Short mmCIF file of all heavy atoms in Angstrom, two decimals:
data_model
loop_
_atom_site.label_atom_id
_atom_site.label_comp_id
_atom_site.label_asym_id
_atom_site.label_seq_id
_atom_site.Cartn_x
_atom_site.Cartn_y
_atom_site.Cartn_z
N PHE A 709 -8.35 -3.44 4.61
CA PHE A 709 -7.94 -2.59 3.49
C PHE A 709 -7.04 -1.46 3.94
O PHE A 709 -6.15 -1.04 3.18
CB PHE A 709 -9.17 -2.03 2.78
CG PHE A 709 -9.70 -2.91 1.68
CD1 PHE A 709 -11.01 -3.33 1.68
CD2 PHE A 709 -8.87 -3.31 0.65
CE1 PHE A 709 -11.50 -4.14 0.68
CE2 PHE A 709 -9.35 -4.12 -0.37
CZ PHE A 709 -10.67 -4.54 -0.35
N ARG A 710 -7.24 -0.95 5.16
CA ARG A 710 -6.32 0.04 5.70
C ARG A 710 -4.92 -0.54 5.90
O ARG A 710 -3.93 0.13 5.61
CB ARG A 710 -6.84 0.59 7.03
CG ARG A 710 -6.16 1.87 7.48
CD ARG A 710 -6.74 2.38 8.79
NE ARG A 710 -6.02 1.84 9.94
CZ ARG A 710 -4.99 2.44 10.52
NH1 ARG A 710 -4.54 3.59 10.06
NH2 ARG A 710 -4.40 1.88 11.57
N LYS A 711 -4.84 -1.77 6.40
CA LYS A 711 -3.54 -2.40 6.62
C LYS A 711 -2.86 -2.72 5.29
O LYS A 711 -1.63 -2.82 5.21
CB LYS A 711 -3.70 -3.66 7.46
CG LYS A 711 -4.23 -3.41 8.86
CD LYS A 711 -3.25 -2.60 9.69
CE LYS A 711 -3.79 -2.32 11.08
NZ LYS A 711 -2.80 -1.59 11.92
N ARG A 712 -3.66 -2.90 4.24
CA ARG A 712 -3.10 -3.28 2.94
C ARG A 712 -2.82 -2.07 2.04
O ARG A 712 -1.80 -2.04 1.35
CB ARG A 712 -4.03 -4.26 2.23
CG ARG A 712 -3.50 -4.76 0.90
CD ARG A 712 -2.21 -5.55 1.08
NE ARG A 712 -2.40 -6.74 1.90
CZ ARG A 712 -2.80 -7.92 1.43
NH1 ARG A 712 -3.06 -8.06 0.13
NH2 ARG A 712 -2.95 -8.95 2.25
N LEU A 713 -3.71 -1.07 2.04
CA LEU A 713 -3.57 0.03 1.09
C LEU A 713 -2.74 1.17 1.67
O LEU A 713 -1.72 1.55 1.10
CB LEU A 713 -4.96 0.52 0.67
CG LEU A 713 -5.85 -0.48 -0.06
CD1 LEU A 713 -7.12 0.19 -0.55
CD2 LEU A 713 -5.10 -1.12 -1.22
N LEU A 714 -3.18 1.73 2.80
CA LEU A 714 -2.55 2.93 3.34
C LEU A 714 -1.34 2.63 4.22
O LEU A 714 -0.36 3.38 4.19
CB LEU A 714 -3.58 3.75 4.13
CG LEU A 714 -3.17 5.14 4.61
CD1 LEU A 714 -4.35 6.09 4.54
CD2 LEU A 714 -2.62 5.11 6.03
N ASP A 715 -1.40 1.55 5.00
CA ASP A 715 -0.36 1.21 5.96
C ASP A 715 1.04 1.12 5.34
O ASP A 715 2.00 1.62 5.94
CB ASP A 715 -0.71 -0.09 6.68
CG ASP A 715 -0.03 -0.21 8.03
OD1 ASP A 715 -0.51 0.42 8.99
OD2 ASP A 715 0.97 -0.95 8.14
N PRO A 716 1.22 0.47 4.16
CA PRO A 716 2.57 0.41 3.58
C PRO A 716 3.16 1.77 3.26
O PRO A 716 4.39 1.95 3.31
CB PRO A 716 2.35 -0.41 2.29
CG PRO A 716 1.18 -1.25 2.59
CD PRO A 716 0.28 -0.38 3.41
N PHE A 717 2.31 2.75 2.94
CA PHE A 717 2.80 4.08 2.59
C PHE A 717 3.49 4.75 3.77
O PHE A 717 4.33 5.64 3.57
CB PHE A 717 1.64 4.95 2.09
CG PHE A 717 1.30 4.74 0.64
CD1 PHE A 717 0.18 5.32 0.09
CD2 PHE A 717 2.11 3.96 -0.16
CE1 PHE A 717 -0.14 5.13 -1.24
CE2 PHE A 717 1.80 3.76 -1.50
CZ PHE A 717 0.67 4.35 -2.03
N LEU A 718 3.16 4.35 4.99
CA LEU A 718 3.76 4.97 6.17
C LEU A 718 5.23 4.57 6.31
O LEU A 718 6.11 5.43 6.45
CB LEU A 718 2.97 4.57 7.42
CG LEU A 718 3.51 4.98 8.80
CD1 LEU A 718 3.98 6.43 8.81
CD2 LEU A 718 2.46 4.75 9.87
N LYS A 719 5.51 3.27 6.28
CA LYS A 719 6.84 2.78 6.58
C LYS A 719 7.72 2.56 5.35
O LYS A 719 8.93 2.79 5.42
CB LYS A 719 6.76 1.47 7.37
CG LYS A 719 8.10 0.90 7.83
CD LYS A 719 8.92 1.91 8.64
CE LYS A 719 8.13 2.49 9.81
NZ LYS A 719 7.75 1.44 10.79
N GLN A 720 7.15 2.13 4.22
CA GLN A 720 7.94 1.74 3.07
C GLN A 720 8.41 2.93 2.24
O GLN A 720 9.31 2.79 1.41
CB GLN A 720 7.15 0.75 2.20
CG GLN A 720 7.93 0.13 1.05
CD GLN A 720 9.31 -0.33 1.46
OE1 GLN A 720 10.32 0.14 0.93
NE2 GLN A 720 9.37 -1.25 2.41
N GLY A 721 7.86 4.11 2.47
CA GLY A 721 8.28 5.28 1.70
C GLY A 721 7.45 5.44 0.44
O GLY A 721 6.23 5.67 0.50
N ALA A 722 8.10 5.33 -0.72
CA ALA A 722 7.44 5.66 -1.98
C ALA A 722 7.70 4.61 -3.06
O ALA A 722 7.46 4.87 -4.25
CB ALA A 722 7.90 7.03 -2.50
N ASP A 723 8.19 3.43 -2.68
CA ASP A 723 8.44 2.36 -3.62
C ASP A 723 7.45 1.21 -3.48
O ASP A 723 7.59 0.19 -4.16
CB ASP A 723 9.87 1.84 -3.47
CG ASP A 723 10.29 1.70 -2.03
OD1 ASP A 723 9.46 2.02 -1.15
OD2 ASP A 723 11.43 1.28 -1.77
N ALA A 724 6.45 1.35 -2.61
CA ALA A 724 5.38 0.37 -2.47
C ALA A 724 4.14 0.75 -3.28
O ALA A 724 3.07 0.17 -3.07
CB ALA A 724 5.01 0.18 -1.00
N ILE A 725 4.27 1.71 -4.20
CA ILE A 725 3.14 2.13 -5.01
C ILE A 725 2.70 1.01 -5.95
O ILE A 725 1.51 0.84 -6.22
CB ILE A 725 3.48 3.42 -5.78
CG1 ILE A 725 3.80 4.55 -4.80
CG2 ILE A 725 2.35 3.82 -6.70
CD1 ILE A 725 4.19 5.85 -5.47
N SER A 726 3.66 0.23 -6.45
CA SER A 726 3.32 -0.86 -7.36
C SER A 726 2.45 -1.90 -6.67
O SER A 726 1.47 -2.39 -7.24
CB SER A 726 4.60 -1.50 -7.90
OG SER A 726 5.15 -2.42 -6.97
N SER A 727 2.78 -2.24 -5.42
CA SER A 727 2.01 -3.25 -4.70
C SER A 727 0.60 -2.77 -4.40
O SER A 727 -0.37 -3.52 -4.55
CB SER A 727 2.74 -3.63 -3.40
OG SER A 727 3.21 -2.48 -2.73
N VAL A 728 0.47 -1.51 -3.97
CA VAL A 728 -0.85 -0.96 -3.68
C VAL A 728 -1.69 -0.88 -4.95
O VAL A 728 -2.89 -1.17 -4.94
CB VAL A 728 -0.72 0.42 -3.00
CG1 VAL A 728 -2.10 1.02 -2.74
CG2 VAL A 728 0.06 0.29 -1.70
N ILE A 729 -1.06 -0.48 -6.06
CA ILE A 729 -1.78 -0.42 -7.34
C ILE A 729 -2.24 -1.80 -7.76
O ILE A 729 -3.38 -1.98 -8.21
CB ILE A 729 -0.90 0.25 -8.41
CG1 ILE A 729 -0.85 1.76 -8.19
CG2 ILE A 729 -1.41 -0.08 -9.81
CD1 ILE A 729 -0.10 2.51 -9.27
N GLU A 730 -1.38 -2.81 -7.61
CA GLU A 730 -1.76 -4.18 -7.92
C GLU A 730 -2.94 -4.64 -7.07
O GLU A 730 -3.90 -5.23 -7.57
CB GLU A 730 -0.56 -5.11 -7.71
CG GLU A 730 -0.84 -6.57 -8.03
CD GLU A 730 0.39 -7.44 -7.90
OE1 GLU A 730 1.47 -6.90 -7.57
OE2 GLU A 730 0.29 -8.67 -8.12
N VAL A 731 -2.88 -4.35 -5.76
CA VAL A 731 -3.95 -4.77 -4.86
C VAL A 731 -5.27 -4.11 -5.23
O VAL A 731 -6.31 -4.77 -5.29
CB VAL A 731 -3.57 -4.48 -3.40
CG1 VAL A 731 -4.78 -4.60 -2.50
CG2 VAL A 731 -2.47 -5.42 -2.95
N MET A 732 -5.26 -2.80 -5.51
CA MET A 732 -6.51 -2.12 -5.84
C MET A 732 -7.00 -2.53 -7.22
O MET A 732 -8.21 -2.47 -7.51
CB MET A 732 -6.34 -0.60 -5.74
CG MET A 732 -5.29 -0.02 -6.66
SD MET A 732 -5.30 1.79 -6.65
CE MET A 732 -5.17 2.11 -4.89
N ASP A 733 -6.09 -2.94 -8.10
CA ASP A 733 -6.48 -3.42 -9.42
C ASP A 733 -7.15 -4.79 -9.33
O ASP A 733 -8.06 -5.10 -10.11
CB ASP A 733 -5.26 -3.48 -10.34
CG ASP A 733 -5.00 -2.16 -11.05
OD1 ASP A 733 -5.53 -1.13 -10.59
OD2 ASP A 733 -4.27 -2.16 -12.06
#
């Protein structure tokens, strides 16, 4: 879950919010 939820926020910036929201949904 760390590699899926928080990890993208480090490198992708601020446009991976949709993917994280989908995953947590």
